[PDB]
Each structure stands twice: as C-alpha cells, then as structure tokens.
Amino acid sequence: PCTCTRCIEEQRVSAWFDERFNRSMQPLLTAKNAHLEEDTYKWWLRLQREKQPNNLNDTIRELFQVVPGNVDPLLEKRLVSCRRCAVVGNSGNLKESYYGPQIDSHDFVLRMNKAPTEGFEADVGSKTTHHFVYPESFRELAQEVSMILVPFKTTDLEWVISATTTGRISHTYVPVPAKIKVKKEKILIYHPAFIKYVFDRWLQGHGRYPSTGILSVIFSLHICDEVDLYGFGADSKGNWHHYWEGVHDGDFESNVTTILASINKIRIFKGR
Numbered sequence: 397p398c399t400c401t402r403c404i405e406e407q408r409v410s411a412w413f414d415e416r417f418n419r420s421m422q423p424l425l426t427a428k429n430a431h432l433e434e435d436t437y438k439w440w441l442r443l444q445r446e447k448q449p450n451n452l453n454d455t456i457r458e459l460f461q462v463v464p465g466n467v468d469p470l471l472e473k474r475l476v477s478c479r480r481c482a483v484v485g486n487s488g489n490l491k492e493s494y495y496g497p498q499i500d501s502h503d504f505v506l507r508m509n510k511a512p513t514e515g516f517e518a519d520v521g522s523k524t525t526h527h528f529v530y531p532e533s534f535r536e537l538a539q540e541v542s543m544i545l546v547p548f549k550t551t552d553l554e555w556v557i558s559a560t561t562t563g564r565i566s567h568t569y570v571p572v573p574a575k576i577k578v579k580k581e582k583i584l585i586y587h588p589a590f591i592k593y594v595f596d597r598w599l600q601g602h603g604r605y606p607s608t609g610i611l612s613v614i615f616s617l618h619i620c621d622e623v624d625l626y627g628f629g630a631d632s633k634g635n636w637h638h639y640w641e642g643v644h645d646g647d648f649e650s651n652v653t654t655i656l657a658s659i660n661k662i663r664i665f666k667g668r
C-alpha cells in the first residue's frame with residue numbers, strides 16, 4: 397500500500413474505477429514485452445494506415461539497439477512508497493494561474509507536445525521529468541528530461557532511430573524534424589498495447605483513438621500513487637487555446653477525467 401493520503405491502485409473504493417483499471421498493464425515498451433497480439437497489432441496499424449510498414453518486430457529490435465530495451469515498465473515505482481505526479485496539459489487556463497511552484501513540488505512532472513516552460517515558469521513551473529511527444533509534435537527538450545515517444549504508426553519508431561542517428565526521415569503526413577538533440581538513453585516508448593487499453597477500457601471505443609492528454613493521464617495512473625492535473629479543459633470563459641500562443645472524442649475524454657476527480661483518484665486544478 398502506498399503511504400500517500402490515498403492510493404490510486406486501491407480497489408473497492410469505486411467499482412467504476414476497478415472495472416477500468418488493470419494493474420497488469422505495462423505502459424512502456426521493453427524487449428521483454430514487445431510481442432503484440434494480432435488483434436492489437438491490426439488495430440494499431442489502422443490508426444494511421446501506413447502503406448506497407450516494415451515488420452514491427454524487426455523495427456523494435458533495431459529500436460532497442462539505439463534506446464534502452466530493459467526499462468522498468470513502472471519507472472521504478474517499486475522503490476518508492478508515495479510517488480506524486482503533476483500532469484500538465486496545454487490549456488490557456490494556466491495563464492495567470494500562478495501554479496508553477498505547486499506543479500514543481502511533485503516528484504514527477506509530465507508535459508506534452510510543444511508546450512514551453514521558458515518565460516511561463518510562474519504559471520506552469522520549470523521542472524520536467526517526462527515529456528510526451530510524437531514526430532509531428534516535438535520540440536527540443538532540456539537534457540535531463542525523459543522523452544516519452546507515443547507511437548501511432550511503425551514510422552514513429554523508425555523516426556526515433558533516424559532522428560538520433562542518420563537523420564533520414566523528414567516527413568510523415570507532415571514535415572518532422574530530421575534530427576533531435578535528446579540523448580538516446582533518455583528515450584522511453586509508450587507501449588502500443590497500452591494505447592489500445594486506454595481506448596477500449598477507459599474510452600469505451602469513443603473517438604478514432606485517444607488524445608495525447610488522456611494517454612498521459614492514464615499512463616500517470618499506473619506510474620504514480622497520486623496525480624494532479626493542470627492545464628486540462630477550457631478556461632473560465634469557455635475558450636480552448638494554448639497558454640503560450642475530429643480524431644478524438646474530447647467530450648467523452650473530459651468526462652472520464654471529471655469522473656476520476658469525483659472519486660478522488662486525481663485532483664483537477666481548473667486555473668483561470
């Protein structure tokens with residue numbers, strides 16, 4: 397049992413939560429766990445429908461010649477008794493929220509997409525432990541930050557290989573960076589099967605596939621004991637914009653987070 401006030405894993409608090417949460421899921425890819433079931437693989441290929449993708453097992457073998465192939469799938473949660481995490485979305489409800497110090501007080505701070513901290517630190521914090529990206533939504537990261545690649549197609553895994561070595565992939569469905577500066581040892585890979593678990597069990601099949609925001613939340617339910625959300629949802633005026641500047645069912649995903657908050661499995665900080 398964790399030593400926090402409450403523990404996300406705890407069963408028999410909410411049967412709605414217990415129906416959905418599966419403690420056996422592994423959120424990160426490793427050489428050990430990389431075999432996909434045929435149904436999961438076919439579903440994952442259908443997300444972006446690449447023509448004639450390379451063999452996935454060959455692609456993953458080549459990937460783990462480059463980035464670490466034996467990460468602990470819960471990032472060494474077994475060595476801590478209360479891991480507290482902040483998941484920071486991109487909403488302009490963070491503007492003038494002054495949430496930075498409270499965000500930075502957490503053990504892990506998880507960010508996503510091209511969201512910057514520089515010049516926004518009083519609102520969004522300066523700490524990042526983990527940052528979710530995909531080739532089409534990447535920005536250079538500070539050297540301490542773990543990069544969590546979320547792969548939506550075979551080419552996303554080939555892009556990690558390329559962008560840290562030969563720099564041969566510069567376009568997917570849009571232009572993508574040919575090179576990144578992230579150290580290979582700092583790269584983590586979101587497991588495809590965990591994407592499908594989010595879609596089937598948490599989203600009950602709503603949307604074409606899950607948004608990055610909700611993938612980040614459910615990932616954090618597994619790796620953390622206590623989760624606080626910042627920068628999710630609209631602002632107080634009903635605007636959806638980013639704090640610095642038809643694929644997903646954002647209303648259904650929103651409602652999952654609202655329900656999670658109502659049963660004290662997360663806390664949501666609404667901002668401004």
Ligand SMILES: CC(=O)N[C@H]1[C@@H](Oc2ccccc2[N+](=O)O)O[C@H](CO)[C@H](O)[C@@H]1O[C@@H]1O[C@H](CO)[C@H](O)[C@H](O)[C@H]1O
Nearest residue numbers: 443444445530531532548569570606607608642643644
């Ligand atoms: C808006 C939308 O449907 N985006 C899809 C679409 O994207 C494009 C296809 C062809 C040309 C330009 C774009 N694009 O810049 O919008 O199809 C691709 C697959 O080919 C993706 O599914 C786009 O969806 C985005 O996918 C990323 C992950 O790659 C992430 O889930 C975004 O939230 C999602 O909008």
